[PDB]
Paper text:
To gain insight into [name]-mediated drug resistance, we determined the structure of full-length [name] from Mycobacterium smegmatis ([name]), which shares 68% sequence identity with [name] from Mycobacterium tuberculosis (M. tuberculosis). Here, we determined structures of [name], with and without bound GTP, and demonstrated that it mediates membrane fission in vitro. Our results suggested that [name], like other BDLPs, has weak GTPase activity and nucleotide-dependent dimerization in solution, but tends to form nucleotide-independent homotypic interactions on the membrane and cuts the membrane.
We also determined the structure of nucleotide-free [name] at 3.2 Å resolution by molecular replacement using the GTP-bound structure as a search model. An [name] dimer with antiparallel packing of HB2 was found in the asymmetric unit. However, we discovered no such interface but a HB2-stacking dimer in the crystal packing of our structures. Symmetric interactions of a D333α7–R351α7’ salt bridge and D337α7–H344α7’, E402α8–H348α7’ hydrogen bonds are observed between the antiparallel HB2s. When purified [name] triple-mutant D333K/D337K/E402K was incubated with liposomes, tethering of vesicles was not altered. However, when the HB2 was deleted, tethering could no longer be observed, suggesting a minor role of the HB2-stacking interface but a requirement of the HB2 in [name] self-assembly.
Residue numbers in the entry: 0 to 63, 69 to 421, 457 to 478, 495 to 594
């Protein structure tokens, strides 16, 4: 549309002036708006009907039972790739894979060569996904041998929305409620889908009750009833009649009005700012040369200024640069603080459990004791992760201000006279739910004491496991932010060095060909300004 033409124009200008850095930047911006990747996470516990919901939604059997996070996005032809982790927070690796593989256990897909597979990304030719919606199927959780529901939080920082699937067999359990509040801390745009309305006749009150609950508990989430079963019948008989009846259109409007529409506005704004910034980088050299022509007596101040801003832009690429110091020290600090937070939470949990143990015959309540512990530990991991996420955002925010405070992105004339692979995946704590089940005054003492001891290592082992991922995660964040600002510093360094020589080369021209040169600089200047002002307000 207008933006494409705008991008098109600007890019053309950047290429004739040999600004290869701006063209690629504009190439990335253009790529962002056609493949927006608007990720919507489909969450919820075991047996609630999530996968059937996704299949009924997209009309395609790509979804499945699943053991690995699966991202479904638009592609004319079916295709699939594995997102494979690299050590020490390095950028994950994409590995194409034949579609026949998605059906079974890529957790240890041979192509992965023993590395941890974070997720699978597959394509599907569903008219629903063309606009840029991408659905993240989550593995089975809440069951024996499965992750806790809070493990789903690891998918949300990179998500734009969440659909919380909760079936209508009974009202919300406490774990569902704690998870919803935690999820909203990271991903505010969310909705509850009350599934299986077709199977349970009293489904109605439960939705209202749950709805009550949220308001009473302060959780702002809309509830959308639905039946995947009716939808499936609907495809078959070509009956719209059933579709209003399935209430699936209600799911789409929320996806349209609260997810797709909200995010599209946000994508256009960042791309217009990208166009404006690129144009202004080009304008700097144009107006610097103009000043050198039209105002010869200020060449000293013009060049002295430009030289200063260039060095500062170059020093910003230094190990010692304040923004990089703040970043490096902040990540190191946050890493230690996050581990400290977790172990504080776990210690509180372990202490409670040990008291519980000394209060009964652990051998007569071991299943319930184990269950409470696994839930408490997994929830603490969730609370720790949310806290860590909030602190990382605050740190990232501080580094941006620090960068900005140095004028390392400023390209106005002096007045005189992440496109890489994301690292999001499931959280990890314990091997699985229901899997911690380890081996008169004397019997009781021996038994009670051993359980606790078993409990404290279990708690310690998880802290160990969680801490490594926390560490590599922060390293990944450090890498992404560093790459971002070194790129900007290089562009700014570049734009300032062109402006400097352009001002020098203009002072060597003679009277005969200055006026000819200026006129074309004003034509050029006017064009960028038209572009800048012209696209600045399509905000």
């Amino acid at each position: 549309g207008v933006i494409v033409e705008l991008i098109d124009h600007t890019s053309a200008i950047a290429a004739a002036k040999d600004r290869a850095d701006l063209v690629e930047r504009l190439r990335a911006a253009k790529a962002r708006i056609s493949d927006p990747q608007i990720r919507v996470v489909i969450a919820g516990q075991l047996k609630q009907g999530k996968s059937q919901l996704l299949n009924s939604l997209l009309n395609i059997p790509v979804a499945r039972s699943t053991v690995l996070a699966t991202v479904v996005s638009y592609g004319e032809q079916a295709s699939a790739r594995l997102v494979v982790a690299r050590p020490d927070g390095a950028e994950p690796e994409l590995i194409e894979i034949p579609p026949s593989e998605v059906t079974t256990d890529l957790r240890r897909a041979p192509q992965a060569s023993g590395r941890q597979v974070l997720r699978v990304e597959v394509t599907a030719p569903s008219p629903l996904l063309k606009g840029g919606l991408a659905f993240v199927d989550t593995p089975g959780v809440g069951g024996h041998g499965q992750p806790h529901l809070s493990a789903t939080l690891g998918l949300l920082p990179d998500a734009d929305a969440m659909l919380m699937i909760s079936d209508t067999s009974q009202e919300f359990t406490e774990p569902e409620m704690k998870f919803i509040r935690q999820a909203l801390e990271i991903c505010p745009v969310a909705a509850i889908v009350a599934t299986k309305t077709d199977l349970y006749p009293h489904w109605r009150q439960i939705v209202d009750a749950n709805i009550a609950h949220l308001q009473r508990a302060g959780l702002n989430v809309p509830v959308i009833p639905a039946s995947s079963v009716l939808r499936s019948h609907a495809i078959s008989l070509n009956d719209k009649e059933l579709n209003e009846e399935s209430n699936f259109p209600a799911i789409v409007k929320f996806l349209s009005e609260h997810v797709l529409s909200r995010q599209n506005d946000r994508i256009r704004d960042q791309i217009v700012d990208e166009i404006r910034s690129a144009a202004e980088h080009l304008l700097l050299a144009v107006e610097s040369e103009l000043s050198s022509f039209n105002d010869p007596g200020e060449r000293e101040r013009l060049t002295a200024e430009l030289e200063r801003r260039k060095q500062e832009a170059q020093d910003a690429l230094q190990q010692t640069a304040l923004w990089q110091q703040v970043l490096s020290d902040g990540i190191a600090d946050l890493t230690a603080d996050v581990d400290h937070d977790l172990r504080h939470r776990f210690r509180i949990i372990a202490a409670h459990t040990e008291k519980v143990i000394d209060g009964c015959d652990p051998t007569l309540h071991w299943a319930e004791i184990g269950a409470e512990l696994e839930d408490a530990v997994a929830t603490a991991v969730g609370d720790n992760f949310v806290w860590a996420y909030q602190r990382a955002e605050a740190l990232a925010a501080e580094v941006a201000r620090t960068f900005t405070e140095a004028g390392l992105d400023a390209v106005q004339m002096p007045q005189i006279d992440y496109g890489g692979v994301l690292m999001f995946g499931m959280l990890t704590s314990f091997a699985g739910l229901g899997m911690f089940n380890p081996l008169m005054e004397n019997r009781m003492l021996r038994v009670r004491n051993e359980a606790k001891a078993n409990v404290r290592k279990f708690v310690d082992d998880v802290a160990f496991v969680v801490g490594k991922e926390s560490r590599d995660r922060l390293k990944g964040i450090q890498r992404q932010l560093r790459d971002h600002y070194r790129e900007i510093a290089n562009q700014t360094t570049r734009s300032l060095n062109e402006s400097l020589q352009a001002a020098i080369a203009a002072a060597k021209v003679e009277e005969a060909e200055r006026n000819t040169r200026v006129k074309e600089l004003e034509r050029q200047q006017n064009i960028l300004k038209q572009v800048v002002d012209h696209a600045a307000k399509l905000a």
